[PDB]
Coordinates of C-alpha atoms and ligand atoms in Angstrom, one line a residue:
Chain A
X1 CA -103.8 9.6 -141.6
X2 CA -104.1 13.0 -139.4
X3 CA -101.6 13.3 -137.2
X4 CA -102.4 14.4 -133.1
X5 CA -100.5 16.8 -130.9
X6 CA -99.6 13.4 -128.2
X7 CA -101.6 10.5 -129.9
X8 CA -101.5 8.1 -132.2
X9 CA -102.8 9.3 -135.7
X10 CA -106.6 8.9 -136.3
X11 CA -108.6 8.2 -139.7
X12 CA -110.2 11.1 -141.6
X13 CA -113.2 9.3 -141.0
X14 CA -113.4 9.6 -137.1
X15 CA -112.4 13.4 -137.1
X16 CA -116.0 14.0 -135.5
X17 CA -117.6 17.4 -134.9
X18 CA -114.1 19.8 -135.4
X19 CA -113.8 23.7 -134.6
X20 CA -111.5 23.8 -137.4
X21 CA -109.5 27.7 -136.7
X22 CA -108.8 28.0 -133.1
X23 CA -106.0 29.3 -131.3
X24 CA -105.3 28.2 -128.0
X25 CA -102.3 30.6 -127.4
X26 CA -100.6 33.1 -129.9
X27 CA -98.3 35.9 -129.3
X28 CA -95.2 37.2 -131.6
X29 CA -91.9 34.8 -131.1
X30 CA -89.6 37.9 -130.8
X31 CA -91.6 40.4 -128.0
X32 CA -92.3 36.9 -125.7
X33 CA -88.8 36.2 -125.9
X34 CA -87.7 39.7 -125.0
X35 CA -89.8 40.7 -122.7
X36 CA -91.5 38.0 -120.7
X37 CA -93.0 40.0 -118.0
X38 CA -95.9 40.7 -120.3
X39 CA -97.2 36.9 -120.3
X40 CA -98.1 34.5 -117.9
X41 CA -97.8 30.8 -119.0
X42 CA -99.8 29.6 -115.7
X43 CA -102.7 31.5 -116.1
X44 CA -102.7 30.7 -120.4
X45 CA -102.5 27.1 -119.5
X46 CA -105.4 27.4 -116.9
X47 CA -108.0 29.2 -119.5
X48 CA -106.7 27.1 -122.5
X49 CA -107.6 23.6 -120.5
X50 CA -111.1 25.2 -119.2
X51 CA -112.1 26.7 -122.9
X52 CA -111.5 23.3 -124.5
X53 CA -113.1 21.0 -121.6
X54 CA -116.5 23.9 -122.1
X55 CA -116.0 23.0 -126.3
X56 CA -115.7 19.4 -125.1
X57 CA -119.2 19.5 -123.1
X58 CA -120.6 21.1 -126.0
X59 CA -119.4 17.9 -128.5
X60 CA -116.4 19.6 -129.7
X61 CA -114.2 16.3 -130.6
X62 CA -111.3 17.6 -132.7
X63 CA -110.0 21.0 -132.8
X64 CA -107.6 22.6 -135.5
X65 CA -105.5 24.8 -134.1
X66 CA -103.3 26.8 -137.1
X67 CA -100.9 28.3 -134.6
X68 CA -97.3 28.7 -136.5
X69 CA -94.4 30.9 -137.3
X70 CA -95.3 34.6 -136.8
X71 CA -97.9 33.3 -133.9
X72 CA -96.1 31.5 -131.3
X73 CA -96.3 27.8 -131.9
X74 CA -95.4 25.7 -128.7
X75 CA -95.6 22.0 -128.8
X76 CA -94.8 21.6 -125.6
X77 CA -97.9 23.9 -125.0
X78 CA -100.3 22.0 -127.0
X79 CA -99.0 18.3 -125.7
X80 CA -99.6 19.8 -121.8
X81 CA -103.4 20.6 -123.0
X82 CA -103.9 17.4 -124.5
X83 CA -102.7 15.7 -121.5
X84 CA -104.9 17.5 -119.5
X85 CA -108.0 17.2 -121.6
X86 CA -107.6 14.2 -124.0
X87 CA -109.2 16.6 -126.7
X88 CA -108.0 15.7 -130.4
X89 CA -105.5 18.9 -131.7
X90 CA -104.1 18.8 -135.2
X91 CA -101.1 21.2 -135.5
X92 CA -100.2 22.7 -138.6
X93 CA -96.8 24.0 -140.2
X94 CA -96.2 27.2 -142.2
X95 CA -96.0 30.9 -141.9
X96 CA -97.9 34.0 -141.0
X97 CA -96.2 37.4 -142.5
X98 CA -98.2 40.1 -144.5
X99 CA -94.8 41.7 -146.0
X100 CA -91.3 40.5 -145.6
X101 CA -89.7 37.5 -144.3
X102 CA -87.5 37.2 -141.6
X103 CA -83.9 38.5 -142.5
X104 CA -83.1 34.7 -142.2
X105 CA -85.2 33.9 -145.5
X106 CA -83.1 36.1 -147.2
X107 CA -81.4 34.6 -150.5
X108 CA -83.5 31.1 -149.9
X109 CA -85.6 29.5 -152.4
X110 CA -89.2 28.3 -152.4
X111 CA -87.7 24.6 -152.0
X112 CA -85.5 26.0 -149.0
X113 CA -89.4 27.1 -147.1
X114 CA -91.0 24.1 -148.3
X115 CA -88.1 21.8 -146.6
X116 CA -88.9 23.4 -143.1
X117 CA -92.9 22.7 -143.7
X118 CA -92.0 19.0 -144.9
X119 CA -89.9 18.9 -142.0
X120 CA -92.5 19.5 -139.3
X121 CA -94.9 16.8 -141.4
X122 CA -92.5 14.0 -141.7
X123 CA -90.0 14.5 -139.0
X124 CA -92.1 16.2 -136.5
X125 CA -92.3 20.0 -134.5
X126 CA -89.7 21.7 -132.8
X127 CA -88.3 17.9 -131.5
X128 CA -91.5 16.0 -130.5
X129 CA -92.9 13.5 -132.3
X130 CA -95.9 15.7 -132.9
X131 CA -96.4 15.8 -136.9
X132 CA -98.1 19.2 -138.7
X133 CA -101.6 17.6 -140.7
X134 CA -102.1 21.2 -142.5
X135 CA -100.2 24.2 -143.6
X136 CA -101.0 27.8 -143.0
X137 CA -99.9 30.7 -144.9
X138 CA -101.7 34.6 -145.1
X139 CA -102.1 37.1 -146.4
X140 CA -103.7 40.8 -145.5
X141 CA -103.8 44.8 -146.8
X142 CA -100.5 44.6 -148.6
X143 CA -102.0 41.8 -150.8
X144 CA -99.7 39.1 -152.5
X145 CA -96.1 40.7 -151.6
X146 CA -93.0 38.9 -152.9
X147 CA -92.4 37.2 -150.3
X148 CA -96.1 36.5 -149.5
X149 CA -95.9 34.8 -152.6
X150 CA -92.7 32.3 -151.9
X151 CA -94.7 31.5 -149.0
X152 CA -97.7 30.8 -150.9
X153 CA -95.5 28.8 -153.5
X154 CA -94.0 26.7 -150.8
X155 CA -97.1 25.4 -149.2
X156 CA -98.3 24.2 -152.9
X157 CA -95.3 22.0 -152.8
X158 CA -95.5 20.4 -149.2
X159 CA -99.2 19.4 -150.0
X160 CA -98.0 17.7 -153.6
X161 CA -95.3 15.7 -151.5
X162 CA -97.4 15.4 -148.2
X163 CA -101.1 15.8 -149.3
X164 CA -102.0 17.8 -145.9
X165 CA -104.4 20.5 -146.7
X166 CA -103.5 24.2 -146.3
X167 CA -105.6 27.1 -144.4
X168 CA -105.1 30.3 -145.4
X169 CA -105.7 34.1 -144.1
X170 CA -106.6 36.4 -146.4
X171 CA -108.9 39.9 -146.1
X172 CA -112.0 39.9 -147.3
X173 CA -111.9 43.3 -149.2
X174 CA -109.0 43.3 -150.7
X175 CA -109.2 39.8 -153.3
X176 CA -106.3 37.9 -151.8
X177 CA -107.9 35.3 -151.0
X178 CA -109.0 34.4 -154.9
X179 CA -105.1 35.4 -155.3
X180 CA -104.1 32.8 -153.1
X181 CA -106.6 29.9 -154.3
X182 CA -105.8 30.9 -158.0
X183 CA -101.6 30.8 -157.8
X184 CA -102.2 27.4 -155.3
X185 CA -104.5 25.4 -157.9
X186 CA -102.1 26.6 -160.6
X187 CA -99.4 25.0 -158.6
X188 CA -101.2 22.1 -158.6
X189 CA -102.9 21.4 -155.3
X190 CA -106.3 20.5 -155.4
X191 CA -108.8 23.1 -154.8
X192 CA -111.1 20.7 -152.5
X193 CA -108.0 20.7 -150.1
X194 CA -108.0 24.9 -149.3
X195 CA -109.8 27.2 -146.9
X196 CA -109.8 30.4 -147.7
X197 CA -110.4 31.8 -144.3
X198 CA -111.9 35.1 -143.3
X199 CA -114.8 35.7 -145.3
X200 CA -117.2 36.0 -142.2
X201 CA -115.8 40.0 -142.6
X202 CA -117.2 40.5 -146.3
X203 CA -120.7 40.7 -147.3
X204 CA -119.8 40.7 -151.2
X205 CA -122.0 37.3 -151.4
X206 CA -120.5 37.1 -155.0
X207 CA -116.8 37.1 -153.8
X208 CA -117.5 33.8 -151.6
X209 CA -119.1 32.2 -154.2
X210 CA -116.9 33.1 -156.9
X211 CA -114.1 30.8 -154.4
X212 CA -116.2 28.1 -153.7
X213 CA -117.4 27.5 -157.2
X214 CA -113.4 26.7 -157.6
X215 CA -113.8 23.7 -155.1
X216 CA -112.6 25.1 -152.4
X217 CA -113.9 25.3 -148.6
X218 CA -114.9 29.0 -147.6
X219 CA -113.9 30.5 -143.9
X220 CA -116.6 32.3 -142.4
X221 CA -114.4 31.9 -139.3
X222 CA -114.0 35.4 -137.3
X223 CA -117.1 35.3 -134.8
X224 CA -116.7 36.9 -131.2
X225 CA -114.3 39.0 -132.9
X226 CA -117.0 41.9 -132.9
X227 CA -114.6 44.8 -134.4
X228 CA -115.0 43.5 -137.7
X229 CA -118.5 42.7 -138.4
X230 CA -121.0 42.3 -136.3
X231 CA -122.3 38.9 -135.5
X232 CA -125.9 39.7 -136.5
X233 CA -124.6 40.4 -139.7
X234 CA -122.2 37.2 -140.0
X235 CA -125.1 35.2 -139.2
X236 CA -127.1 36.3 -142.1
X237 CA -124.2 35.8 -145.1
X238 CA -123.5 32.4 -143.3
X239 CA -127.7 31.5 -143.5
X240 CA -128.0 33.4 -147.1
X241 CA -125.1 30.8 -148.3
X242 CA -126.8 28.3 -146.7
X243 CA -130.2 29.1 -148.3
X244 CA -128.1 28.8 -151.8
X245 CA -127.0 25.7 -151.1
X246 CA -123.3 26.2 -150.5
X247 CA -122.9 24.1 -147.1
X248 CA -121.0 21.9 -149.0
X249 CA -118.0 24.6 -148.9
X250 CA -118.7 26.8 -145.6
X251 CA -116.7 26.6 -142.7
X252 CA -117.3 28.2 -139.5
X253 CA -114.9 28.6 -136.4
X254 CA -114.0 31.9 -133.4
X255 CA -110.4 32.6 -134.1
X256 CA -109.5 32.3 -130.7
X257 CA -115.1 36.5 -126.5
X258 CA -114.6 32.5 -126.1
X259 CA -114.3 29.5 -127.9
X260 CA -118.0 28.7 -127.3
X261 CA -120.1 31.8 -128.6
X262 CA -121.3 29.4 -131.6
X263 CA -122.9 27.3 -129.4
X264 CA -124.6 30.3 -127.5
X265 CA -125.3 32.3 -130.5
X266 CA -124.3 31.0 -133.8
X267 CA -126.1 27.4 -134.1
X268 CA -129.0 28.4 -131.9
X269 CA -129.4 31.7 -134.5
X270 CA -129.2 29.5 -137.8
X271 CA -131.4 26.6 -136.2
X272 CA -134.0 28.8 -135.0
X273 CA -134.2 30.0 -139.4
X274 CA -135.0 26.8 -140.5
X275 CA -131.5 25.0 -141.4
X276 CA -132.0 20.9 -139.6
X277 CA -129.1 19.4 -137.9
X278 CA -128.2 17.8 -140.9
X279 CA -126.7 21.3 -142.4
X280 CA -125.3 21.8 -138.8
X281 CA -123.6 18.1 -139.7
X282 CA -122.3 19.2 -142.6
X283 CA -120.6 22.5 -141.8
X284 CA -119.0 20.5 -138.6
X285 CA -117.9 17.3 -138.9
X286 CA -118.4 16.2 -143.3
X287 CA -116.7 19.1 -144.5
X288 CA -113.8 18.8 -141.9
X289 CA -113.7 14.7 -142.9
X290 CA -113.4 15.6 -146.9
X291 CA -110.6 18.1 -146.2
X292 CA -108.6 15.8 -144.8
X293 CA -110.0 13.1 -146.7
Chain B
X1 CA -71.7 53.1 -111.4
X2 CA -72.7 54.3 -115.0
X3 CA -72.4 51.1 -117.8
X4 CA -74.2 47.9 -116.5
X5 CA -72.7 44.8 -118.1
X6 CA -73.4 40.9 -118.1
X7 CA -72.7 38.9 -115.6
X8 CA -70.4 41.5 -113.2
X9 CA -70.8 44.8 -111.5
X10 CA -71.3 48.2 -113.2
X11 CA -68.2 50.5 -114.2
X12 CA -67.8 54.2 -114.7
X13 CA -67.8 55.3 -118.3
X14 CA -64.1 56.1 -117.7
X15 CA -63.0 52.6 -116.9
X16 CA -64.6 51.5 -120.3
X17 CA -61.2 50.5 -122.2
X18 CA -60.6 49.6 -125.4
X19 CA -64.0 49.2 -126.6
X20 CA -65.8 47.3 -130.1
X21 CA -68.9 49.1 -129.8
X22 CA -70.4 47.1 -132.1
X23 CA -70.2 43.5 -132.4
X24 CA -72.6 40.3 -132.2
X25 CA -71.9 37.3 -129.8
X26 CA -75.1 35.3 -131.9
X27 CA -78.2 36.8 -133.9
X28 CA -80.5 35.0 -135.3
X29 CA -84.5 35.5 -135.7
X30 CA -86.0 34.7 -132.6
X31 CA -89.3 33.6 -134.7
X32 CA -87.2 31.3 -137.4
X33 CA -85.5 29.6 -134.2
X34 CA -88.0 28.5 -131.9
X35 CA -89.8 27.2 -135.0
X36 CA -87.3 25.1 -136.3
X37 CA -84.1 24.5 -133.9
X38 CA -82.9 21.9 -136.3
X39 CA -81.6 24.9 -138.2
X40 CA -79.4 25.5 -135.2
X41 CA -76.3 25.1 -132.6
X42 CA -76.0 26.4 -129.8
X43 CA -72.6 24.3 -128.6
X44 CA -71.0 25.3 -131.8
X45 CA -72.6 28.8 -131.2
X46 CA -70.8 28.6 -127.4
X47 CA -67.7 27.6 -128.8
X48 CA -67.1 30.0 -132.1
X49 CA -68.2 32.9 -129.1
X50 CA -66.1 32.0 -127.0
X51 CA -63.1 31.3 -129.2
X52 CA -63.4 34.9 -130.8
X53 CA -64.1 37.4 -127.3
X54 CA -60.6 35.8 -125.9
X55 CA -58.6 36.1 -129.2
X56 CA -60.1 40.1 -129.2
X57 CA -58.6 39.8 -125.3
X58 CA -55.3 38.8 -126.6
X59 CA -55.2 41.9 -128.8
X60 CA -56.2 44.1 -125.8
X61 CA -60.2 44.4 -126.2
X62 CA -61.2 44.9 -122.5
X63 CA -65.4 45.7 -123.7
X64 CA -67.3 44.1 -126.1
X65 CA -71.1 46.3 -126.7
X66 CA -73.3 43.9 -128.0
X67 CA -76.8 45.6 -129.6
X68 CA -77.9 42.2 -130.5
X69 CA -82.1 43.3 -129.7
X70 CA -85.1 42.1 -130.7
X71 CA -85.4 40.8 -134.1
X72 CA -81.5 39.6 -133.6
X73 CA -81.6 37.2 -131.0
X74 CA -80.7 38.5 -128.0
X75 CA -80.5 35.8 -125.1
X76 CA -78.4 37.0 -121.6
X77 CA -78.2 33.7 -120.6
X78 CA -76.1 32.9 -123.5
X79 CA -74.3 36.1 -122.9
X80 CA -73.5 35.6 -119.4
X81 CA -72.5 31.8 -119.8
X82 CA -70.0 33.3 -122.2
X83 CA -68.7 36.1 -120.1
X84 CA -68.1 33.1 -117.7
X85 CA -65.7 31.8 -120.2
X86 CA -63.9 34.8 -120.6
X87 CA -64.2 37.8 -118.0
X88 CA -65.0 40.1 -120.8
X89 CA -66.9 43.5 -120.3
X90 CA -69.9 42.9 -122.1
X91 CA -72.9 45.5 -122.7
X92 CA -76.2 44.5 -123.1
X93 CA -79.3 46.7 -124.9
X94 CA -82.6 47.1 -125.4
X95 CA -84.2 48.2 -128.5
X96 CA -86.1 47.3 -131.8
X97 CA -84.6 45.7 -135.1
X98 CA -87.0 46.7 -137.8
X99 CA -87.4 47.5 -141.4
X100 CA -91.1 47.8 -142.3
X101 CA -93.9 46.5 -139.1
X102 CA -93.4 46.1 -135.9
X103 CA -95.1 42.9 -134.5
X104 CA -98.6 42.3 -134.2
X105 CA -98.4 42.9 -130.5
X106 CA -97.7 46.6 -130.9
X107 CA -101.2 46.9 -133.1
X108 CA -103.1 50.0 -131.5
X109 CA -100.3 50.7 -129.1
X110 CA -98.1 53.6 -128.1
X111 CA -95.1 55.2 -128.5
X112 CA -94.9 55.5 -124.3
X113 CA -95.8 51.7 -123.9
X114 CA -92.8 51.2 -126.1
X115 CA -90.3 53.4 -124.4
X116 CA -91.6 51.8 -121.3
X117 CA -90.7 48.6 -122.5
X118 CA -86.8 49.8 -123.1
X119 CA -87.2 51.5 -119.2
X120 CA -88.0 47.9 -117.9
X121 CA -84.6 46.5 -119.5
X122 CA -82.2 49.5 -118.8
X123 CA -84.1 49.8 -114.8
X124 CA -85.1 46.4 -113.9
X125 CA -83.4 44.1 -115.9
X126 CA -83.8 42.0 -119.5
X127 CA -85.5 38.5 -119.7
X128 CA -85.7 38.6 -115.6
X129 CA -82.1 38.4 -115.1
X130 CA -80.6 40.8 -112.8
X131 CA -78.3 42.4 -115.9
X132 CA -79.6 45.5 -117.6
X133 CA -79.3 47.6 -121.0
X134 CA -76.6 50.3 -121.4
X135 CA -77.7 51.7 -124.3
X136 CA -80.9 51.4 -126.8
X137 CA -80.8 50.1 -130.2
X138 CA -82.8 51.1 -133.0
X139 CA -82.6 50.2 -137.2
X140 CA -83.6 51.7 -140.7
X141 CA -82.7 50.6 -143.7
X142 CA -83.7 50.0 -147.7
X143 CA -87.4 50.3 -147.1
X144 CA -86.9 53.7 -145.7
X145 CA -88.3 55.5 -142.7
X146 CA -91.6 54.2 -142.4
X147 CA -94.6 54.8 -139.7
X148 CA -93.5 52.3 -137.2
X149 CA -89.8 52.8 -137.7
X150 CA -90.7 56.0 -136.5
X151 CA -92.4 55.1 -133.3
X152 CA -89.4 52.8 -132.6
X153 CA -87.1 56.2 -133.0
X154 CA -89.2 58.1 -130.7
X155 CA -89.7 55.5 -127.8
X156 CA -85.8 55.4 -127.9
X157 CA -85.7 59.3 -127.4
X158 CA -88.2 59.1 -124.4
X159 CA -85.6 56.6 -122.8
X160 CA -82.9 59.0 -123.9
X161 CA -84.5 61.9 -121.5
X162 CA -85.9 59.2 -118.4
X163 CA -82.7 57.0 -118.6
X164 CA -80.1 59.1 -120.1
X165 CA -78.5 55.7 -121.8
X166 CA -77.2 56.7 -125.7
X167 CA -78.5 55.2 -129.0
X168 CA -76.7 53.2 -131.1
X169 CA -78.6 52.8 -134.7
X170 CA -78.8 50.7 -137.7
X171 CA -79.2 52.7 -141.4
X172 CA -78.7 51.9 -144.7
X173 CA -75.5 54.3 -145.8
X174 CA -77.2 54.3 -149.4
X175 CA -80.4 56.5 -148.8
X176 CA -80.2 59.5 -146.1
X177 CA -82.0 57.3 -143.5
X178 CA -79.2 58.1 -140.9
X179 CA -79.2 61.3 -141.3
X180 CA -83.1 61.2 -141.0
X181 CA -82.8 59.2 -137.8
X182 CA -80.3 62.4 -136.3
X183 CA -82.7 64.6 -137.6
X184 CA -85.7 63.0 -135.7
X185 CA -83.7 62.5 -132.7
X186 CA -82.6 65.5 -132.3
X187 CA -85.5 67.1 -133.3
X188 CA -87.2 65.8 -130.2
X189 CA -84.2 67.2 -128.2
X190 CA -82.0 64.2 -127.6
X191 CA -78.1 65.0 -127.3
X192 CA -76.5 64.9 -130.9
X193 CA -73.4 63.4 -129.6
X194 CA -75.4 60.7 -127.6
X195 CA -76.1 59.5 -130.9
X196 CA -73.9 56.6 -133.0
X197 CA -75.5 56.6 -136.1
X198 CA -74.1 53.1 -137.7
X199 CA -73.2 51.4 -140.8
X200 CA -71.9 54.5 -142.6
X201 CA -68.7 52.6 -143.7
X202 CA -70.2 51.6 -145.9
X203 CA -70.4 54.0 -148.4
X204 CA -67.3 55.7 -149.6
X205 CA -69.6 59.1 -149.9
X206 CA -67.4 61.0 -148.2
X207 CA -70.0 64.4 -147.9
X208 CA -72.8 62.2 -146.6
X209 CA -70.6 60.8 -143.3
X210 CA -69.2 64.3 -142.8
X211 CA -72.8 65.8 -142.9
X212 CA -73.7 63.9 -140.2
X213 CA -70.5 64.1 -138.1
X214 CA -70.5 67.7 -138.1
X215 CA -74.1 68.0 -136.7
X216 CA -73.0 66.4 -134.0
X217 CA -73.3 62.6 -134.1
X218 CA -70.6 60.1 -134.2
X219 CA -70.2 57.9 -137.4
X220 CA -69.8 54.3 -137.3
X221 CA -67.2 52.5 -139.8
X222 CA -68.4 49.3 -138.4
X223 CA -68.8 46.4 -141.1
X224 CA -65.2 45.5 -141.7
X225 CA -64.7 42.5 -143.3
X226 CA -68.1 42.7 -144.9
X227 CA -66.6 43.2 -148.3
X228 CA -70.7 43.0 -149.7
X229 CA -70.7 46.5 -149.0
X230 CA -67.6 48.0 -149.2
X231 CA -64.2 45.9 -149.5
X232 CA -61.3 46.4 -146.5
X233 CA -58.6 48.5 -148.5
X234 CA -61.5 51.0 -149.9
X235 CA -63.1 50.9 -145.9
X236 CA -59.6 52.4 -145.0
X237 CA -59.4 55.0 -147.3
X238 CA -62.4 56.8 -146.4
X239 CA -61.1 55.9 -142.4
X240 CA -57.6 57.8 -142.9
X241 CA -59.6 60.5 -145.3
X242 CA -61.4 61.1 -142.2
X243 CA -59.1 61.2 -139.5
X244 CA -56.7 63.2 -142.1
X245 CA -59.5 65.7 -142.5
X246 CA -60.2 66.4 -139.0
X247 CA -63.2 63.9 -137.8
X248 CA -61.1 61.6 -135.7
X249 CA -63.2 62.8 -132.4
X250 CA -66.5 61.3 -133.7
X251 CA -65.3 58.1 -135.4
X252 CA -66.0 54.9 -134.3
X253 CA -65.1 51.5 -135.5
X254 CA -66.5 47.8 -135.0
X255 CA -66.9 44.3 -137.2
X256 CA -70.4 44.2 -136.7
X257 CA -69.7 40.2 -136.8
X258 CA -72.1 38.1 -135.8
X259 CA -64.0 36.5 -146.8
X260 CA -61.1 37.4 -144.2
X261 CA -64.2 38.6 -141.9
X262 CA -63.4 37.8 -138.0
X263 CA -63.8 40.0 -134.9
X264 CA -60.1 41.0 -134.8
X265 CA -59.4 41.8 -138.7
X266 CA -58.9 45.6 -137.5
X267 CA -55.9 44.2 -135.7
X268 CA -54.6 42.5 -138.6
X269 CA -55.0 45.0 -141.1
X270 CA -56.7 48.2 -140.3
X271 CA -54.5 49.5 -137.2
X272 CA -51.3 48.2 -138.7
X273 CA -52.5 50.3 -142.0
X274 CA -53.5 53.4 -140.5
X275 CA -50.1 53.7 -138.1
X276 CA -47.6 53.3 -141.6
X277 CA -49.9 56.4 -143.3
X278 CA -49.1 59.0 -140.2
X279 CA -52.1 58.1 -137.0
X280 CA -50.3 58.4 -134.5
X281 CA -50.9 56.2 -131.1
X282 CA -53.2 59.1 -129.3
X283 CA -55.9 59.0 -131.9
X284 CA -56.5 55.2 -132.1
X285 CA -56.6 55.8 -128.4
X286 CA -59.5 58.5 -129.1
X287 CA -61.2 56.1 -131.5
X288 CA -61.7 52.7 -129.4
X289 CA -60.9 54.4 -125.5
X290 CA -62.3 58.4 -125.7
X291 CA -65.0 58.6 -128.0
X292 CA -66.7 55.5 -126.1
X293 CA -65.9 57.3 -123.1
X294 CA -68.1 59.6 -124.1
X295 CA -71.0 58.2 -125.6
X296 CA -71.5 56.7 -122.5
X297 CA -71.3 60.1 -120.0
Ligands
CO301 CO1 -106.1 34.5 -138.7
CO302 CO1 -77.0 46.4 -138.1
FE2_303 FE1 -106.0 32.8 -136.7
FE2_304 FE1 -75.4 44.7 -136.0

């Protein structure tokens, strides 16, 4: 029911423990195809199979890895990791703009975007077989722009026809991540099958509620990433919300500093304050199963 | 010696010939593409590209400048594999195509990393082929000049002094951003008339081009057959207004192709109109031989 990046589909049931926002390579389409003596793609592969075996001595089974237009999605890329790891990848469809669309968007409609995300779940990605299981869309500083918003529209129509789930990016200070779960569930798609990401950078404990008393799974996804929040700071909104009772909704992933700093500091901070590996169990492996349940 | 070009040996800004200065072999959104090539061609592509530089050949076109950039589309190896097909003269660029952002990548960084980035294409080569960029190419439009549009304009200045290429630009004819892209430029001490500032067919303001081709810069009547913006008969009045009124020395005129629109409708209509209303053979010899001759010196 969850498509792989070079395997057969897998239940929802046998997801297993999931990092569910993780990027194994991103860059901008245009400046890599312009000017490739900025990249390497031998020393990207190298570090991508090494970071994922690490996750996989840890217990990481599945990884999520919401890599699409505006970051550099490469099939090809992901099928060579999985080849040389075996790790379980779920690609996504969608799009990643904070203002305008490409000039190629220009006089298409919300059914036009939402052919090229049904596309990539029922045909497949850029050729390969390789089927999207989720759609991503964002949103930042500008807030919901027009074309933010067709986005936002056409992702609210591939899940109603192909009832994969949709990740989102949003900033934390600025409301647009209620914007986004409040136009998507008015649309239709079921609020248990959202993540609002980014709300590790906020410590407005009533704004993340406030999003998962809708129903919907809350990103406290940006660890590692030490320019936004601290860590020691992350790790007390993630434990607070715990201590309310909200691990039914939270989320926690990098945004891939390494791929593995929960392991070192996350989990060991939040098990060492009480919370049994049964909240642990939730957060990485139920909560992943029920949103693509 | 002077104007690289794709897939042959560089010339001297006086063997240029009759130039378009401003026509597309392909564009397309490099991000759109390599997400979804089902939306795409690239044997029709060959074949429509192809087709059109050799008909231009047949009407006399010896160099085709192609500012096809990032954000277009631009791909040498395409390029090349036509120029294969046809022997044409083709001149590649560097440069941004922009209207609001730049890309993510650019987030912190500097005007010099930028122009540095144009340096590696004009000195080294573009997409590690051995052809380089003879010009750079930068855009404004509707949105107006905005912060990064800005740092696009000044990294092509700084490889305006280090490489002495010229600039050919993008604006929107509608809202003074040309002029505000000469005014930067030149601000920062570039030479006005190393400057094509582009798209200003298509207005029929007549003040507004003038403005800017008396400071200096040459205009571009360069969308024919876009009849969106300004249809063909009204493109050729303000052309003959022009030439009538002195300002055939800094006029230039292209397609910009990428109704009747093809990349020889100038030889089906706009030559043929301006020679029966008194422009004599000398000056459409100034407008697609001398003026490029000069741009490029
Ligand atoms: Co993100
Ligand atoms: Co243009
Ligand atoms: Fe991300
Ligand atoms: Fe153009």
């Amino acid at each position: 029911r969850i498509p792989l990046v070079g395997k057969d589909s897998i239940e929802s049931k046998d997801i297993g423990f999931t990092l569910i926002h993780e990027h194994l390579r991103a860059f901008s389409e245009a400046v890599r195809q312009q000017w490739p003596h900025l990249y390497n793609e031998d020393e990207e592969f190298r570090n991508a199979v090494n970071e994922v075996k690490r996750a996989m001595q840890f217990g990481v089974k599945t990884i999520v890895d919401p890599t699409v237009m505006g970051l550099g999605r490469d099939t090809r890329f992901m099928e060579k990791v999985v080849k040389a790891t075996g790790i379980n990848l779920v690609a996504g469809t969608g799009i990643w703009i904070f203002i305008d669309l490409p000039f190629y968007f220009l006089n298409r409609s919300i059914d036009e975007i939402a052919d090229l995300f049904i596309h990539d779940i029922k045909e497949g990605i850029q050729g390969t077989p390789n089927k999207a299981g989720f759609v991503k869309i964002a949103a930042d500083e500008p807030g919901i722009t027009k074309d933010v918003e067709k986005v936002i529209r056409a992702a609210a129509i591939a899940n109603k026809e192909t009832k994969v789930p949709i990740i989102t990016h949003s900033n934390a200070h600025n409301n647009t991540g209620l914007e986004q779960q409040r136009i998507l569930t008015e649309e239709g798609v079921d609020p248990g099958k959202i993540l609002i990401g980014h709300l590790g950078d906020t410590d407005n404990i009533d704004y993340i509620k406030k999003i998962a008393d809708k129903g919907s799974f809350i990103g406290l996804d940006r660890y590692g990433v030490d320019l936004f929040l601290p860590v020691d700071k992350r790790n007390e909104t993630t434990l607070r919300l715990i201590k309310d009772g909200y691990s039914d909704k939270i989320m926690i992933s990098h945004d891939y500093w390494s791929i593995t700093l929960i392991f070192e500091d996350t989990i060991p901070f939040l098990k060492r304050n009480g919370v049994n590996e049964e909240v642990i169990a939730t957060i990485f492996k139920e909560n992943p199963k029920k949103f693509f349940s």
